[PDB]
Amino acid sequence: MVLSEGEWQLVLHVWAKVEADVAGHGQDILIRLFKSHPETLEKFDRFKHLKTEAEMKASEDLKKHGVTVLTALGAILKKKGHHEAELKPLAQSHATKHKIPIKYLEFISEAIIHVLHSRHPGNFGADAQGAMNKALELFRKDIAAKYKELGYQG
Ligand code: HEM
């Protein structure tokens, strides 16, 4: 699948507002994921002891990881589909070390769309959401293909 230039522009336009507060978006997305799908929290030995949203919001450690997550995803998006090099080490560690099924990549994709919809309604209308969903579907499809090459079904 291939996105048009118009679709990439919708994606990068809303991402530019995300980059105004990377740590805050990183927090909201991870907390959203953990509250909506609590089984994902079990993949993080670092975090699985956090019992409540209040404890999550206070964790400087979780906030740091949100920044790492959003910075990696941002670098991928800015490649506008030319992301094979960024994707190799990410697929390797999430297949082999962390063992993250594609289903969980779908769950965090929903958290991203939900947070952007909440914080940026003016820049995340139907067309912009469609473009963002397409970009994330492309990310997941390419990561799934690498998973298969590396020997993990996901
Ligand atoms: C857009 C989706 C995601 C991106 C861009 C991303 C990115 C990253 C990056 C850059 C790291 C640090 C380096 C590395 O180990 O590769 C990391 C670590 C990690 N990721 Fe992800 N990740 C994503 C989704 C997920 C999901 C959905 C889960 C689990 C449900 C997960 C589980 C983990 C774990 C357990 C670690 C190790 C954390 C630690 O102990 O420090 N990742 N991720």
Q: Domain limits of the chain?
A: 1-154
Task: Write out residues with Cβ below 6 Å of ligand 1.
Answer: 40, 43-44, 46, 68-69, 72-73, 90, 93-94, 98, 100, 104-105, 108
As separate numbers, helices (DSSP H) first and strands (DSSP E) second, the chain gives 7, 0
Q: Environment class of residue 116 by beta-carbon count within 10 Å: exposed (0-12), middle (13-18) or buried (19+)?
A: buried
CA dihedral 123, 117, 129, 37 (to 10 degrees): 160
CA of 53 to the centre of ligand 1 (A): 20
Q: What gap in Å lies between CA 99 and CA 85, rounded to an integer?
A: 20
Resolution (A): 1.8
Please check whether residue 144 is in contact with residue 154, taking contact to mean a CB–CB distance below 8 angstroms: yes
Q: What gap in Å lies between CA 77 and CA 114, rounded to an integer?
A: 18
Q: What gap in Å lies between CA 24 and CA 31, rounded to an integer?
A: 11
Q: Environment class of residue 92 by beta-carbon count within 10 Å: exposed (0-12), middle (13-18) or buried (19+)?
A: middle
Query: Which CATH number describes the domain made up of 1-154?
Result: 1.10.490.10
Residue positions forming the annotated binding site: 65, 94
